Amino acid sequence: ILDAGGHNVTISLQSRTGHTHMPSVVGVLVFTQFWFWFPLSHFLSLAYTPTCVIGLNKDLKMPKVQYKSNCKPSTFAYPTAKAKKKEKNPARVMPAQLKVLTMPETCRYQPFKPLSIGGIIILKDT
Amino acid sequence: AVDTAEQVYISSLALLKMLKHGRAGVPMEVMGLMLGEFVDDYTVRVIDVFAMPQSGTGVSVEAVDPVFQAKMLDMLKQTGRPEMVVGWYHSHPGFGCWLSGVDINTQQSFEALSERAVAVVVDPIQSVKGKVVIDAFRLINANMMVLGHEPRQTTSNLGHLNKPSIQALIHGLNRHYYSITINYRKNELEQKMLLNLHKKSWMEGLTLQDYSEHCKHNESVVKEMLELAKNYNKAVEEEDKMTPEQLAIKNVGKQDPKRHLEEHVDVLMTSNIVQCLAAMLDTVVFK
Amino acid sequence: MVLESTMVCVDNSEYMRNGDFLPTRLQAQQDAVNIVCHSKTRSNPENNVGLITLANDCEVLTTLTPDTGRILSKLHTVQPKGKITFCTGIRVAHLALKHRQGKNHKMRIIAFVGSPVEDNEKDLVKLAKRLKKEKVNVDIINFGEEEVNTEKLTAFVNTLNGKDGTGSHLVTVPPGPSLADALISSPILAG
Numbered sequence: 001i002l003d004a005g006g007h008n009v010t011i012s013l014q015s016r017t018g019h020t021h022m023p024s025v026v027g028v029l030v031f032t033q034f035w036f037w038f039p040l041s042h043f044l045s046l047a048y049t050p051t052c053v054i055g056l057n058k059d060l061k062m063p064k065v066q067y068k069s070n071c072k073p074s075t076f077a078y079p080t081a082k083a084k085k086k087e088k089n090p091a092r093v094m095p096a097q098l099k100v101l102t103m104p105e106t107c108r109y110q111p112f113k114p115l116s117i118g119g120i121i122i123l124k125d126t
Numbered sequence: 127a128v129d130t131a132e133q134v135y136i137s138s139l140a141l142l143k144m145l146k147h148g149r150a151g152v153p154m155e156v157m158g159l160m161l162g163e164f165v166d167d168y169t170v171r172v173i174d175v176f177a178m179p180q181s182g183t184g185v186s187v188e189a190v191d192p193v194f195q196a197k198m199l200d201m202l203k204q205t206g207r208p209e210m211v212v213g214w215y216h217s218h219p220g221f222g223c224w225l226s227g228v229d230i231n232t233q234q235s236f237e238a239l240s241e242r243a244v245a246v247v248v249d250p251i252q253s254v255k256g257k258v259v260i261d262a263f264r265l266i267n268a269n270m271m272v273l274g275h276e277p278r279q280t281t282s283n284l285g286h287l288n289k290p291s292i293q294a295l296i297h298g299l300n301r302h303y304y305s306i307t308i309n310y311r312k313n314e315l316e317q318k319m320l321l322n323l324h325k326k327s328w329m330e331g332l333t334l335q336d337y338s339e340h341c342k343h344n345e346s347v348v349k350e351m352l353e354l355a356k357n358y359n360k361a362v363e364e365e366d367k368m369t370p371e372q373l374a375i376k377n378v379g380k381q382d383p384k385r386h387l388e389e390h391v392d393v394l395m396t397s398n399i400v401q402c403l404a405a406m407l408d409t410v411v412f413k
Numbered sequence: 414m415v416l417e418s419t420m421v422c423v424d425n426s427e428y429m430r431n432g433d434f435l436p437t438r439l440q441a442q443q444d445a446v447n448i449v450c451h452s453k454t455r456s457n458p459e460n461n462v463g464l465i466t467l468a469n470d471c472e473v474l475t476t477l478t479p480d481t482g483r484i485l486s487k488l489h490t491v492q493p494k495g496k497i498t499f500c501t502g503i504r505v506a507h508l509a510l511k512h513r514q515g516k517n518h519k520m521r522i523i524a525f526v527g528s529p530v531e532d533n534e535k536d537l538v539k540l541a542k543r544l545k546k547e548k549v550n551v552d553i554i555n556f557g558e559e560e561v562n563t564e565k566l567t568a569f570v571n572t573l574n575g576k577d578g579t580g581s582h583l584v585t586v587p588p589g590p591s592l593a594d595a596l597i598s599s600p601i602l603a604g
């Protein structure tokens with residue numbers, strides 16, 4: 001559980017938009033009792049959802065972008081000046097570290113939409 | 127070969143013949159036989175239970191009478207359902223219902239003939255009401271010493287069967303033997319009527335008579351036990367008025383309370399029987 | 414051997430107590446029970462044969478069993494006084510045939526009618542079509558005094574079965590003095 005997805009992903013039953021995630025709830029409720037049916041422990045893999053910041057600008061093209069996070073490196077430890085992240089393979093991120101991060105000011109590619117949560121978002125060429 | 131978690135589906139008629147055949151022999155241990163059908167490895171059912179006669183050899187593999195088995199199965203053939211035999215059982219009223227040396231001495235014969243032949247033991251002594259009691263036993267194969275001795279899979283009924291861990295001398299048989307789970311299948315209509323059958327005790331005999339017998343006595347000589355209850359009023363409450371003063375001396379609770387609580391509140395619940403059933407007189411006497 | 418259960422019916426009607434069949438119909442039908450129980454014994458060991466009293470109240474004192482010993486005991490001191498009753502006499506043995514444990518035995522009834530019966534033709538034809546639905550084959554042997562060349566009983570056996578059904582045969586006592594053994598000599602060789 002704690003290491004699920006190499007610590008990069010976790011279970012999320014509630015999206016930021018306010019809608020519940022059906023396969024995660026369905027995954028964990030069938031996962032409730034593993035004693036009767038042992039393979040029910042595999043159904044929890046559906047409950048795993050990726051938590052990452054995806055810097056994909058659009059389509060197939062992958063820009064190179066690094067932006068700063070204000071949290072200390074102690075929060076970045078996954079067993080300061082600026083964080084080093086993708087540049088979209090995206091990079092893992094904590095839901096608590098998504099509010100402190102800021103879009104790059106001096107980079108050529110800047111998001112048109114205000115950046116708040118992670119996932120895949122638009123990145124506009126400036 | 128293949129081993130999976132086992133469950134014994136039992137019929138109430140089987141359990142009835144179990145404890146009935148075990149109660150009539152107390153203290154002496156009796157010998158029965160289990161009847162049912164083998165559906166598969168991971169599930170088993172006992173749909174009937176019949177009793178073997180007691181002989182001079184005692185409880186032994188020779189105590190089973192072959193001509194009794196031939197005539198019983200013939201009597202089962204004229205009976206509605208002539209199902210095939212499965213396993214054996216013997217009661218142990220005098221002790222903690224553990225398998226003895228003769229029990230395994232007949233177990234290699236029952237495992238010879240029948241593939242499974244689950245051994246069941248039952249005793250009346252342990253609990254008078256609220257426990258399944260009984261017991262369960264199955265002989266593990268000594269030829270399995272090569273491979274591992276620790277199945278099954280789907281540990282649900284297994285890990286829940288082991289608890290309490292059943293003492294020491296009983297789980298001293300957990301080496302070379304293992305228990306098996308028992309569940310009560312419904313058959314809800316018969317279970318419900320037989321539920322009310324014993325409820326006739328604490329409810330009423332007919333659900334009418336016994337508390338119309340409470341309308342027979344009905345305060346009658348029932349004030350005599352109220353006079354003894356009001357003697358329990360005087361007795362218990364004359365030492366109950368000594369308690370709160372002593373509480374002020376010792377400062378305060380000695381933990382305690384003496385209890386010396388409730389009690390005659392129930393006598394006032396019989397006063398609810400007084401007011402109700404006597405208020406029925408206005409309905410009885412008038413029309 | 415052939416699989417079936419034969420139910421023999423003695424005639425307890427008051428007209429069966431006369432000694433016209435030597436020495437007496439009591440011992441005559443007793444020998445008739447002797448020859449049917451020993452023939453079915455020589456036929457198949459699995460055949461179980463009980464007895465039924467047709468006249469007055471119908472009660473089977475001997476549960477259906479292959480051993481005829483208890484049947485031979487009931488042949489004595491049977492006290493066969495009463496009025497013959499037909500319609501119930503076949504159905505009472507039919508209920509005794511539905512109590513058989515094994516279902517592989519065919520239903521077979523043998524009865525003796527030695528007395529004139531008041532049974533209407535509508536009752537015997539209702540039992541005839543009822544036995545047609547129940548497949549029961551009944552072989553009756555008429556003893557005693559009755560209507561000369563019995564018709565309603567012959568029409569009862571005729572209309573009882575058909576195609577083939579091989580079958581129900583009726584043996585009527587000939588109008589002449591003869592021993593009971595000579596009357597049962599024909600059915601034992603051929604039905």
Ligand SMILES: [Zn+2]
Nearest residue numbers: 155185226229
């Ligand atoms: Zn014993």
